[PDB]
Amino acid sequence: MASRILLNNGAKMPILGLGTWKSPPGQVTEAVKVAIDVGYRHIDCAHVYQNENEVGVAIQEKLREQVVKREELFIVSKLWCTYHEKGLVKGACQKTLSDLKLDYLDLYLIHWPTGFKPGKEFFPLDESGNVVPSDTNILDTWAAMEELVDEGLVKAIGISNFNHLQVEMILNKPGLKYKPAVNQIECHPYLTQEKLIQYCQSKGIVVTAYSPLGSPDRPWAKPEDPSLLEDPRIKAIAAKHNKTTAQVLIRFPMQRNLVVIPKSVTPERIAENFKVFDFELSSQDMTTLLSYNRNWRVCALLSCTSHKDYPFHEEF
Ligand SMILES: NC(=O)c1ccc[n+]([C@@H]2O[C@H](COP(=O)([O-])OP(=O)(O)OC[C@H]3O[C@@H](n4cnc5c(N)ncnc54)[C@H](OP(=O)(O)O)[C@@H]3O)[C@@H](O)[C@H]2O)c1
Ligand SMILES: NC(=O)[C@@H]1C[C@]2(NC(=O)NC2=O)c2cc(F)ccc2O1
Ligand SMILES: [Cl-]
Q1: Which of 16, 18, 20, 21 to mutate to test the pocket of ligand 1 (most atoms within 8 A of CB)?
Q2: Which residue ranges does UniProt annotate as crossing the membrane?
Q3: What CATH number does residue 309 fall under?
Q4: What's the domain count of the chain?
């Protein structure tokens, strides 16, 4: 299995990256240093994660150390919902660049299709509870993203949590200058995403699978929720291949032509999660894992279900 996938901007993207949502600021610098030392070349970041400065300390140390060259890293970040405003997009990108200690991003994503009222709060609320939207058309946010490419701040632009009608709207944008390179979406055996993945791939958009292990550290986890890592059917496939359940869960999206971004702050697991290029799941294994689909979502942005652009009312 090749390590990189070709994007529609002509650049190559590592199919395995390190996730950083929930990685504590006092742990993520070591996590990213270890990741780069054991082979990771792709880090998935976001301003809303509140840890980009600490991720950046690690990246900069490894560049200064000459453990890696900048051209060999693939750093991804995302535009938060409170920065949809065309006049805030550049400053949001530049703050992320400054925090990450970078002069460009390899990929910058619109984090969600939903724009929120700008301000200090990431989830600005009305007195009665709901997300206060912004009025900025997401085609206009896309144009602002295109300007970042034309200014040299980012090499590629893309989207995240867009449903197929929303992807289509971008593809059909009057005057579209750059297609999205990537759509980053939740994907794992309980949310297999066949319909949306086929759509994106037919349009030459690469899909990145987030929460591939089912996000056991998500802050709203409950006892009775289904657990990928503990599912005896998945552990059986792992046992047959002499791999861990996490390794099967990471290899699965790789064999669907997806990029995958498991998160860990545990050095042994970071190294574990990378040793997935030495085995193959059979077609029968792949179809069996696909059969576990339950339409079960980790990340449903539940405060935003009446936003006009909430993505998950549509089938796909
Ligand atoms: N675009 C979006 O809206 C969006 C949404 C969600 C996620 N993401 C991205 O996708 C990344 C991954 O998703 P996620 O963080 O939700 O969850 P995940 O990667 O599915 O699961 C992370 C959890 O699995 C544990 N873990 C990692 N490797 C393990 C292993 N080998 N064995 C057992 N447990 C293991 C981690 O523990 P330790 O860390 O304690 O080792 C952590 O609790 C995020 O960090 C973020 O970068 C993006
Ligand atoms: N509730 C949700 O679905 C999202 C998920 C999400 N995780 C992620 O990586 N992207 C997200 O937007 C997240 C991250 C945060 F830092 C804060 C909130 C939050 O909520
Ligand atoms: Cl963000």
Answers
A1: 21
A2: none
A3: 3.20.20.100
A4: 1
